[PDB]
Amino acid sequence: SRVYLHPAASETVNYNVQLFGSSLPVKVMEALSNASADEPMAACIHEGGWAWLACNDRLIIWKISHSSSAKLMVCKELPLPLSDSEWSADLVDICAQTGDPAAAQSVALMAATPEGSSRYWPNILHEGTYIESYTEFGSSLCAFVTAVKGNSFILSSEKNQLVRLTPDASGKMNQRVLPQGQGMLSGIGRRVSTLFGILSPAVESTLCSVLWDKGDCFYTLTDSSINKWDLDDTSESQVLNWDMSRVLREYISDAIWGSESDYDDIKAGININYLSLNQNCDGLVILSAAWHPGDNPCQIYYTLVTVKDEGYNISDEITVEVTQFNPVFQARGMQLCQLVVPNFSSQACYLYTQEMIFACSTGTGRSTLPQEKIPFEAQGDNIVGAGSCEGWPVFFIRKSGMLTVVARETASVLPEHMEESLSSVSKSSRQ
Amino acid sequence: LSLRPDVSLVIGGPKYSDCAGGYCYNESGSLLSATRNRFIHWTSYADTLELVELSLDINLLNNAVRLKILNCSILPGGVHICETQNNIIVLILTNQTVHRLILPHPSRMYRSEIISDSHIQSIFTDIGKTNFHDPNNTYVIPAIPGRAPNSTASTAWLSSDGEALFALPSVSGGILVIKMPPRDMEGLVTIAELKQSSVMQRLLTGWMPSSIRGDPGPAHLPVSLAVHTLDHDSYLFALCQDHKLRMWSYKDQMCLMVADMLEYVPVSKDIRQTAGTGHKLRLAYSDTLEILYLGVYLHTPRQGQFCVFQLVCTESNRYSLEHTSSIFTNQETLIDFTFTLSSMNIWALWLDDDNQTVMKHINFERNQAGHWNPVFVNPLPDDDLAIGDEQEPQEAYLECLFAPGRFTIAALQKAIQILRKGSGRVLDLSWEELKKEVTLTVEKEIQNAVVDYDVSQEEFRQINIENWCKFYTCCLQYQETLSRPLALVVHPNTNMVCLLRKGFLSFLAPCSSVEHLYLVPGEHLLTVDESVICDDVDGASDIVSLIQCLHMIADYITEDMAYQMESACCHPQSPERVAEQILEDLIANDIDNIMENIQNKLQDIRNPIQAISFLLQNMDYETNMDMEQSQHNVRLNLSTLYGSVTASSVVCQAIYKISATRFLICRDLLILQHLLLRLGDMALVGAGQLLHSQQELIPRAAQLLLSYYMIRWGSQCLACAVPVDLLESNLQHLSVLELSDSQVEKRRYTSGIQTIVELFFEDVGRKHFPQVFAHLFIQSGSSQVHRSLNWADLIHRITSYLLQLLWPSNPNFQFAECLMRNCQYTQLQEYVRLLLPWCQVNVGSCHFMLAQCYLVAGEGHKALDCFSQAASEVEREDFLEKLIRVEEGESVSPRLQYYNRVLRLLEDVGLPELVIQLATIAISEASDDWRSQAALRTRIFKHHLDMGHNSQAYDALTQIPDTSRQLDCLRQLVVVLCERSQLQDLVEFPYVNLHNEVVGI
Amino acid sequence: YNILEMEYAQKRSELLSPLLILGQYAWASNLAEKYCDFDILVQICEMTDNQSRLQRYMTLFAEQNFSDFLFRWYLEKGKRG
């Protein structure tokens, strides 16, 4: 017996694709077909049991949950706040403490417009009350929102200004700016750094990736540094600031193109953009995009830059595995091939695009899982989003909804054969 | 229609999108006043606002308009409607703009509904019916002062003078009043600034820092607004973010009274963070007292507080608020609330922390915190249906998706376009094509999913669970999108409440006593006094204990047990046997002493007989016989009432809910009576008459459980969406077969869903309304067609009549009659399958309809067998005897006459052997008429001819007594033998004493 | 539309069988040629052996798929030569 198999994934049995117990609201297909996902539309899966999609200037949310014979999931329609420099679902995040098929019990929202005004919902389903908070931004384009513990949020600008917005049990919304950087070579970084304010000689590079490591860690990958905070319910303390602007650049350049003898002349041209900051059993992995525009055609080389996060801090050891995924690229407006690690203890890391998933490993970690491609080559099967829910890697698909890949129906490895080889390699004969 | 303002809303505060509202016509009531059940509702999504005018009893043609105020999103609670003897004036306020629209009045669009119609044109026909002209009717909020985004206040009114007065929250914290000229002349739109003091005092305080006698502060920014007109002054009450209710005088342009309403509520500091938009204010002006009431919702993330204040006027033309009541409320955030002064009743719609959206109502004057009688919403889509590898998911998934109240036709369509992929839309489909599309698209996904070389039970159940779960959860998410609330509306005059969800509008209906008791949990039952539950406090306590036992039995019964009862009941089994089996199951599984508590509560009862008889008397509406039946409207101006598509929808939803609840009540009551029987009837007060009463009622409970099983099943048994002419042709084929009850009835199929109950109601019930109307108008309410319809009593009486016509112990055969007239033979087949094993009367009718479907299928022998059982009760079942006696009596024996008519029927069916057999059966009755004897014998002769048994025909001829018929059949014989070249027959016939007949011939 | 056309087809087929059983060859030919019915004209023209009108109808209905029924009825009548 085998479990329900996707058509394009039918050949793939090493991992089994199963309906999570949740499929997308019908309003979602209609919105997507009216404004295609190859246009910039941003969807997110929440491990607390939710999913949302932002399109044009609208957001749509619906519960997601694992099911025995289906479950009930609420669907709601929301307006993205006006004054959008560009619309995205990343300005909206939830601090959900729930994980059930009734996971709507611990929901709080903060959203920001690209002017620094923030709208707070005590609950999505308490329609009739808003909280307006003037964050420190005057008209600055807010970029990201990171839900951290304490039901609090980290508002992020395009220049990576971080402000923890803290709900009150009364109903006011608190703005406390996160300190920016301490470095090891730059100037003063203990002075508060915020736009519409004074300037300090600290690193303020644009925010590339974030990861609320559930080991009390808030990691922010940038193009120049990884910043690690501990963000307790009411407190923030930047434990680490690793200046990665140089080091990983030379390591990735050597990992991809280190053979040539014109390294010094060519290195001026390589731009290495560290796409994502994920975490697996070995530690933090720094998904990097390295390419040289001086050599054509443009080939984006991805390198898994793993740094051993011990739960809080990443070791000074770095392992850069140059890893390629096909010559072809898909797009929704940007060149995309994104790596997601659904859990912080699972070896499998899933690259994904509009047409295929690739479950693989860094190649330098403490263990490994088979490198397998799960295709979804069809119309209406484009991957709208990816994430984790209830311990299993889930993907939001255009006209199919929430589908998870479960590691099962894969071959095993035996240790007796290698011992047999050791036994047989010895002893000789002559006559 | 898109309206273009020149300015848009101001950002920087609470949002203004996502609002809605409604206006109910005071002219509603009576067949001819200006309106009847007519009202208007609107939903504003930011810059779009949809207005639909709906009437409950009549369909309004072209009654929906979409107005796009593109620039400013419409403020929540900013749409107001006023009436003038010629036109309806619509006043709408937005963040930075104000609009006045003129609409034709219903009575000014002519008033006459003498003609008996089902649909009627609304007051919208073309673009000429709407207007947005006169930039004096629309005025721009001036830069001085403007309108702050940190508030949602907005109100409008027509002053007693006639001026259009628009109150907005001023940025300084006062009230900005846009004064548009009256409906008589058009000047320049004027501006007023209701501030702390007048112009003279403002000039006096202009050189000192005043915010109480000068220009106010943003802390006084009005959050909610209400207005009262007295003489020629407009007094404005403003709830603000500092919890000071502020009153401004329209002519005085100054603030008169500022009251700390926090004196009347528990002063929470969390009220202040809701002082922006969580606070609500409604105003209701009682004309019977000339007193306006302010209901104020001080929301708090802890708990909201409702407070009611009466306006009493002093001899200075100043009003004051007196605290009538303060009803405490939840922190569930209020979508809306209202309060009607025709009843002193407060209705409140909250959203809690689950899409089980919260609805209650309570009177302020009665309580100091209210008890808030609950309101039960439609069922949200269910979780678990059939677990793959543990159950075949597909059947349960289909059944749940087709379960009404938790799924919709739009959801089914759009999940079809899920499983069909593509960017095209799947919408506006017939019902049968819809279900076929559902099946086909799920099967297409299945076929793409399956590539297996070995097919297995678990693989099958799995592919089922993912495919049907995808479709099911898409429809579930859409139904949850539909479950989102928007607004609430109440109609005092004809007494119904409407709830605008996202898109659709639902209705709220009162329950019976028994169903209220059974659906309300134990806590709120104690909040209901013993006076209305039963006349006696003793009887009320007995019924309360009975309902508590029912509730504990229901909670102890799980879904697997429910499936067990369904399977065993569809299996041929008496309901009593299944009930006692399940009672034994509960006894065996009883470790919780839940039966011990049930027995204790049963012993707490002093006389369960009257409680059982009361629950069964609110049940028993049965009227045997059929002589009051009306299958068409008796044209007495009554046929203009009800019978519409919306009426059918609401009635069928009510029927579905009532049946779903009360069939379970039947099942639990039978189980509880069996449990009481096993406990013993010799240990209760009134034991002597208790013992025989329970034994008498147990078969009654069994039959009534079967009846409401049938009713609840019919409420969900679908009806095919097919055209009328095809069914007409099918009925014509039936009539060709010599079949009665093949009547053709013109009914209008709905473009959407059809159950067999919908079919029956739309086909028969509307036609029988005039007789129902003739009875009910006399019984209660106005007997005239202009009755102010009493809806709560009307629904109960309609339910009683429908139960009378659906009683299976009665000759009332109208449901199966409608099914056969509408050609639903499959539905009829499972109908008779479920009805026959326990059928009371008209078992012969069951065999009739069975065999009629059988003959339509073309099974001669077995269809005729069921005809034989039908003939076994033609003159012995009352409904069939209604259909006959046009076939009995007369010169011949009635049974012989029926023999002859069915002989003609078989000659219209075919198969001369069948005519042979019916003649052989009739030969026993044929001993009385020589004419019938000769006719049957000649038929035998002619059949002998047909299959060529010539000697046998000769013998049949020699049988014939009459010499005249002998000569006639001799001529037939000679002609046919000559044409068949069968000469030897003619000679070798050894005729004698017929020789001369043959010679002459 | 095709449902109506097909149902019309069988219905007049059974409607029109009886007098075909009974004879009346000239009138059968007249009506069938007026309304363009291939097979009936075939079977009548060969139980009348009139190969001449056989060719004339084949020429008339070359675009109307005469030859399919020609081959068929040849097959059932066992003159495959």
Added chain:
Amino acid sequence: MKQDSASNATYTVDCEDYVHVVEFNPFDSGEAGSLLAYGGISYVVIASCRFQEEDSTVEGIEFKTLKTFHHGERVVAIAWSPETRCDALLPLLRFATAAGDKKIRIFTSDFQDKNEYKVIEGHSGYINDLVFCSPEGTDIASVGDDHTCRIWDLDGKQIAMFILRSPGMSVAWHPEGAFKLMVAEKTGTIRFYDLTTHQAILSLESVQVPLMSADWCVRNTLRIGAVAGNDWIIWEMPRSSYPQDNKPAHADRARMFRWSKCNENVFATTGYPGKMKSQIAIHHLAHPQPILIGTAPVGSGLSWHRRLPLCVVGGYRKLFFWLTEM
């Protein structure tokens, strides 16, 4: 005017009794002469049938009644064991019969020595159809108007139960035998039960009411044809869950669908003899119109020859044979 096609039966056998039901062998028993069984109120007759192919000693048709049993009941349904055998000195014949008494009789015969039948508990109503759900003939699957699929042993003990939500009309054993039991229901659904695990392994879904009859292709078990509503339908499992072929079966009410037991492309759908004489229409695959159509004054029961394309219908005192050849 127009006429479609009709003819007189290729062969016809006279009878002194009516033929309620007449059937050949689904699988060969080891006899050149084709065994034929027909039943009625007065008599049930087993016989050997031959039609001339060689030798002048046989002219036209030769019908030799192997045995005739005195009856007093109208036969409802008959199913031989899929284990077909007549090659012995005293060949053993095993089959099941349904009568009007709602009872099941396991009739066995030992060739001119004895004839026996067993009493088996029937259905609350009439039993619509029944087969031997074992490739040797020891277990019997019966379906009737009581939506119960009952599996009985040779003793008359009810081995197994399958509950239905609608009166089960048609049951079919796997012709080869793989514990596969086909269930055809009046709405139009097909359900495959594995007798070992007592659960459905596969299903074909349809809603065209009503379904009247169905038939596997004897040469292609994966191909299923049927009659429903007015039309013959075809699935090709396991790549179907909705009908893939749907072409009209009759101007009459199609009653039985049968497959010719010589070919993989020949089948018959029978018309209902109501007012007008029963139409019999032999179709072909990829050809929507029936290849042959004949007329019978009475049509009740239709069967196909064990190894050859001949379709048989029995009526009042006559037995009509259509020899379909190419």
